[PDB]
């Protein structure tokens, strides 16, 4: 089992028929999905997978960025020194499962280890010729849509003790989201979380960030700066960009002796045409909002965290604000599983 | 040649703000964080925060929190500081410094400005 | 949080004579993360050593880091008159307070 690169290809159930963008794209680079795949349990088995160097991430990045270029047409986009200026219809905007599968000679190996922490060797492990459906949702801050821990919620970074480096939370329950903009400001929205359901979930994260944190408090805070893409909740619903402000969901404090025990929490949020692209540096102005109610409930999977540094002068006490804006974290999280290797 | 220059130096009265620029040139401004540093004389050496030039994303030492702010300019390859709320103790030498490779360790700074003093005075 | 304890504090020493500075962080940090820099008035501090071990780009073989677990070491074997200074150690965005080489002929 030596690993090594090898160009992928997808899978997908696309319609061949949608006008929606994701079907579009998937009808001409993907091919039909096997519909009983295999997949052989190996036996007295251990390899070393790493979620931070796995060329699979890299290579669906370049499928989003391709698919997001040749779909959403805003009016104007400016590209370094370049500006463009073309016309901009509404799109349909719904992202579908994409399957990543080994060419001929190659496979992947998955990680079948519920408590797997991304880096290190594998010991319950599988081979698959493809990957699970993943949906390439572009967001911040809250990781929709995706996929669950088995058993317990997952705390994973390439190095926890290094705040220069993300932290990426993995649920074990959904926390449902639901984002309308009603049919005043027609760039006014808000998102519906529930307050139980989202604070239950903080203790028992602030519990698995206590473990590479012995003692210590844990504290959730808002963004601490950048544009407005990282500072707020920022995703795409129905083709237009919405940008809601997450600071009711990361304002509150945990020690050890908080973890220790309906209404909503609905967060502000506005759907801006003034976008800040996250596939290449540039900046791009899309049509003011359709008309009709926009509504979309997503499934929260995922965190993005940031780990404020430097010696705190209180004793002790540890801080994580929402991070983001490098896709390939998006991806990521859904490709920590896997590895390509080489048929030996 | 990978170089980082920073503006000259300012003089400000206790109470006042100062901004700190640094000039990047000689590789790719977007794909290497931006560190800063303050040099006290009797303090040697501190970190005070990055910033990621994707997006603006930063991270602020706790004990300047209230009082920094990190900006860019991707267009001129420049990075930002701006400090408020001066004191008498806060005369230092402000260093703007990068990492030494691409994609690596991100605290091994090999690449360092020349440096901004900012002396608080009345 | 982690303190990196620099020991000692000043180093009077003579040029030709051989300079070893401690380093000891509150935690065990590998033995590819602590980095050495050097110190003079005038410029910016010089990145000297990074892994614990590595001598970075244009600094002499006059200087070596060693150290595993906790212990680190900054060797100067001969100390040239240029190598007077104060010598900073750093494992994350933390800093020892650092130590000074002295002239001392």
């Known amino acids: 089992w030596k690993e090594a690169t090898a160009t992928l290809f997808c899978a997908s159930d696309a319609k061949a028929y949608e006008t929606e963008v994701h079907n579009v794209w998937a009808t001409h680079a993907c091919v039909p999905t096997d519909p009983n795949p295999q997949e052989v349990v190996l036996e007295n088995v251990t390899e070393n997978f790493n979620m931070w160097k796995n060329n699979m991430v890299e290579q669906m990045h370049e499928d989003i960025i391709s698919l997001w270029d040749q779909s959403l047409k805003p009016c104007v986009k400016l590209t370094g020194g370049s500006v463009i200026t073309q016309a901009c219809p509404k799109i349909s905007f719904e992202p579908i499962p994409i399957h990543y599968c080994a060419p001929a000679g190659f496979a992947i190996l998955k990680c079948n280890d519920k408590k797997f922490n991304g880096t290190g060797p594998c010991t319950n492990v599988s081979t698959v010729q493809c990957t699970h459906g993943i949906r390439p949702v572009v967001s911040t801050q809250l990781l929709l849509n995706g996929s669950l821990a088995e058993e317990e919620i997952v705390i994973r970074s390439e190095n926890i003790t290094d705040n220069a480096k993300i932290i990426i939370v993995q649920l074990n329950e959904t926390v449902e989201i639901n984002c309308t903009r009603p049919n005043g400001d027609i760039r006014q929205a808000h998102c519906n979380i529930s307050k139980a359901k989202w604070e239950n979930t903080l203790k028992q994260i602030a519990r698995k960030l206590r473990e590479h944190f012995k003692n210590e408090t844990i504290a959730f805070n808002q963004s601490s700066g950048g544009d407005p893409e990282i500072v707020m909740h920022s995703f795409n619903c129905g083709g237009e960009f919405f940008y809601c402000n997450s600071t009711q969901l990361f304002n509150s404090t945990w020690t050890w002796n908080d973890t220790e025990v309906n209404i909503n929490i609905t967060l502000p949020c506005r759907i801006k045409q003034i976008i800040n692209m996250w596939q290449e540096v540039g900046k791009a102005m899309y049509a003011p909002p359709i008309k009709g109610q926009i509504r979309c409930s997503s499934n929260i999977t995922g965190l993005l965290l940031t780990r404020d540094g430097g010696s705190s002068t209180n004793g002790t006490t540890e801080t994580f604000r929402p991070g983001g804006g490098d896709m390939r974290d998006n991806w990521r999280s859904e490709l920590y599983k896997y590895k390509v290797v080489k048929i030996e | 040649q990978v170089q980082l220059v920073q503006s000259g130096p300012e003089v400000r009265a206790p109470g006042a703000s100062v901004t700190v620029s640094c000039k990047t040139s000689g590789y790719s401004f977007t794909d290497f964080f931006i560190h800063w540093v303050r040099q006290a004389p009797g303090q040697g050496l501190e970190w005070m925060g990055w910033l990621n030039p994707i997006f603006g994303a930063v991270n602020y030492a706790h004990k300047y929190q209230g009082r920094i702010t990190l900006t860019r300019d991707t267009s001129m390859k420049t990075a930002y500081m701006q400090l408020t709320n001066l004191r008498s103790d806060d005369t230092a030498v402000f260093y703007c410094?990068?990492?030494?490779?691409?994609?690596?360790?991100?605290?091994?700074?090999?690449?360092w400005g020349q440096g901004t003093l900012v002396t608080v005075s009345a | 949080e982690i303190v990196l304890t620099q020991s000692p504090g000043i180093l009077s020493l003579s040029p030709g004579e051989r300079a070893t500075l401690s380093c000891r962080t509150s935690?065990?940090?590998?033995?590819?993360?602590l980095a050495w820099y050097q110190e003079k008035p005038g410029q910016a501090p010089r990145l000297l050593v990074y892994?614990?071990?590595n001598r970075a780009t244009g600094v002499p073989d006059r200087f070596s880091g060693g150290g595993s677990g906790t212990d680190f070491t900054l060797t100067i074997s001969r100390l040239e008159p240029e190598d007077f200074a104060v010598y900073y150690c750093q494992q994350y965005e933390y800093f020892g307070r650092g130590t000074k080489v002295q002239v001392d002929i």
């Open positions: 892994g614990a071990s």
């Open positions: 935690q065990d940090v590998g033995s590819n993360s």
């Open positions: 410094v990068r990492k030494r490779v691409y994609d690596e360790y991100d605290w091994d700074w090999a690449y």
